[PDB]
Design a protein around this ligand. Structure first.
Ligand SMILES: OC[C@H]1O[C@H](O[C@H]2[C@H](O)[C@@H](O)[C@@H](O[C@H]3[C@H](O)[C@@H](O)[C@@H](O)O[C@@H]3CO)O[C@@H]2CO)[C@H](O)[C@@H](O)[C@@H]1O
Ligand SMILES: OC[C@H]1O[C@H](O[C@H]2[C@H](O)[C@@H](O)[C@@H](O[C@H]3[C@H](O)[C@@H](O)[C@H](O)O[C@@H]3CO)O[C@@H]2CO)[C@H](O)[C@@H](O)[C@@H]1O
Ligand SMILES: OC[C@H]1O[C@H](O[C@H]2[C@H](O)[C@@H](O)[C@H](O)O[C@@H]2CO)[C@H](O)[C@@H](O)[C@@H]1O
Ligand SMILES: OC[C@H]1O[C@@H](O)[C@H](O)[C@@H](O)[C@@H]1O
Ligand SMILES: [Ca+2]
Ligand SMILES: [Cl-]
Ligand SMILES: [Cl-]
Length: 496
């Protein structure tokens, strides 16, 4: 596991989705380390099938063909180099572990794979592992199609093929052990933990049996006796047969209710208002905070027919997105993951993006480097949300207020709200269609604080808005509904 195993006082990770290992290594050194980020979720580092139709989609990386560390992100040398260099500046690496399945059961036999390993999907042959037909669930699945036909039946969901993907027999010790050997190699290299991909589609007990095999973390960088951080991808928005809570014994779980509900609120859809967020967290029926991995969007649902559908806020909706991410990073609930994306050409037919397959920025299938511009944005159509001032400064906010309680909530009964974290930070939102102008109790020591949304503290100056806090802890906040960023945030370390 439940402990993130970030360096003490670093409280977020970022998904550097489809980034190459060498770019992540550099990003750790030049940015993530200095700016107090806890760690990086990386794309699946194990060999996957090449998909040519369409041309190299992002989702080809969720069709394993071996556990060789050999992908469009880089080779094993490059992967090791990244883990080392990131750990050495206090930034952890968490691996997206794709362990429920191998590649599509309909895929062709051959060496069209990211490391050139052979496989024969039709005959269930993966000699680079090795797996054979004995190692898959084909006989155990009881549906006529061999696929998942109803999510109301937990057995189907776990024992049958998810969109045609060959389903590993996770009951078998052979298979559990093959997966563990992969994960343990990663741990010994210096990885801090794992996203368990497609956890809904495995039995909690099978996952447990894999996790029980795992090494303690590498003592070059971690305290003796450290267990790998585990967060399991389970989409459970409530009202379905399989529940998040089934997986609490194994580690944390993705709380997909979080972004779905928050997006709907901040969009002001379905009658929802920001003032309703006063009891955000368990009060909204979420899992326990100490079980939750939270996020506004992830790599799936930012394309807009995942968990949350069109309510999910993304970099495409930058203004409201920064508000949602700001609220998340200020609020004590959950352990926070920040998304970092690339741009693609969206093309909505009947409200589905038929271009939602498009893979990372590339020249002829070779992933582009991340270039850094003078203003600290990225080129090559990497969006780099994690470098937006409004987000990076809120990542720092969360560090600064770590451990401080939810306090001093205020709202106007509509869509203006505020709250603080003990005596170490305070944040104020206007999401109404009129002016915010109020004097609020911040819980903070009197003084002058730089707003870290509009600017930064530089020496003994602020580059943006300044907040003068009275002796009694109150301050005026004045925020127009036409402000570019209609929220203000201050904390102990932005005080002059
Ligand atoms: O040939 C099998 C199958 O391949 C394609 O399905 C892909 C999905 O379109 C795509 O959403 C993706 O799904 C995964 C997620 O990123 C991960 O979080 C987790 O939620 O599980 C999914 C699997 O690990 O990847 C699949 C597989 O590539 C294609 O669209 C299908 O038509 C085809 O049947
Ligand atoms: O606690 C379990 C439920 O938590 C969440 O419910 C939200 C509602 O979605 C949200 O509308 C809001 O409810 C307010 C309601 O709209 C209004 O008519 C009433 O007067 O005040 C309510 C409280 O502000 O807040 C609740 C949480 O308090 C979650 O969305 C839901 O699925 C859970 O069942
Ligand atoms: O720190 C870099 C810049 O971050 C923000 O710029 C964002 C902007 O907020 C967002 O709406 C847009 O979609 O992306 C840009 C970055 O490309 C700050 O607003 C800028 O002042 C910073 O320079
Ligand atoms: O320990 C988890 C177990 O749960 C059972 O209900 C399933 O039938 C097994 O396949 C699985 O191994
Ligand atoms: Ca399964
Ligand atoms: Cl189980
Ligand atoms: Cl996820």
């Amino acid at each position: 596991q439940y402990a993130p195993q970030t360096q003490s006082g670093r409280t977020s990770i970022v998904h550097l989705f489809e980034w190459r290992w060498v770019d992540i290594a550099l990003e750790c050194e030049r940015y993530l380390g200095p700016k107090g980020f806890g760690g990086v979720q990386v794309s699946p580092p194990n060999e996957n099938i090449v998909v040519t139709n369409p041309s190299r989609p992002w989702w080809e990386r969720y069709q394993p063909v071996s556990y060789k560390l050999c992908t469009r992100s880089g080779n094993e040398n490059e992967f090791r180099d990244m883990v080392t260099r990131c750990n050495n500046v206090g930034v952890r690496i968490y691996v997206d572990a794709v362990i429920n399945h191998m590649c599509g059961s309909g895929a062709a036999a051959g060496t069209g794979t990211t490391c050139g390993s052979y496989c024969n999907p039709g005959n269930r042959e993966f000699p680079a592992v090795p797996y054979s037909a004995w190692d898959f669930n084909d006989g155990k699945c009881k549906t006529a199609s061999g696929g998942i036909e109803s999510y109301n039946d937990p057995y189907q969901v776990r024992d049958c093929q998810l969109v045609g993907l060959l389903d590993l027999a996770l009951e078998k010790d052979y298979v559990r052990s093959m997966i563990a050997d992969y994960l343990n190699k990663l741990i010994d290299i210096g990885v801090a933990g794992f996203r368990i991909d497609a956890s809904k589609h495995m039995w909690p007990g099978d996952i447990k049996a894999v996790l029980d095999k795992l090494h303690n973390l590498n003592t070059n960088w971690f305290p003796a006796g450290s267990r790998p951080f585990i967060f399991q991808e389970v989409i459970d928005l409530g009202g379905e047969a399989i529940k998040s809570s089934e997986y609490f014994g194994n580690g944390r779980v993705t709380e997909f209710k979080y972004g779905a509900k928050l997006g709907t609120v901040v969009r002001k859809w379905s009658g929802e208002k920001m003032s309703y967020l006063k009891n955000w967290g368990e009060g909204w029926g979420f899992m326990p905070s100490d079980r939750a991995l939270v996020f506004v969007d992830n790599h799936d649902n930012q394309r807009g027919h995942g968990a949350g559908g069109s309510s999910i806020l993304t970099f495409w909706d930058a203004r409201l997105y920064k508000i949602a991410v700001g609220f998340m990073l200020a609020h004590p609930y959950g352990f926070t993951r920040v998304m970092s994306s690339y741009r693609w050409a969206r093309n909505f037919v009947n409200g589905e993006d038929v271009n939602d397959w498009i893979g990372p920025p590339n020249n002829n299938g070779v992933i582009k480097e991340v270039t850094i511009n003078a203003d600290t944005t990225c080129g090559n159509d990497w969006v780099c949300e994690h470098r937006w001032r409004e987000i990076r400064n809120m990542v720092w906010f969360r560090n600064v207020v770590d451990g401080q309680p939810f306090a001093n909530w205020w709202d106007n009964g509509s869509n203006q709200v505020a709250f603080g974290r003990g005596n170490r930070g305070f944040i104020v939102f206007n999401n109404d269609d009129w002016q915010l102008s109020s004097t609020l109790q911040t819980g903070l020591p009197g003084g002058t604080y730089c707003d870290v949304i509009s600017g930064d503290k530089v020496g003994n100056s602020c580059t943006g808005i300044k907040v003068y806090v009275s002796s009694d802890g109150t301050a005026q906040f004045s925020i127009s509904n036409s402000a570019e960023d209609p929220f203000i945030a201050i904390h102990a370390e932005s005080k002059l």
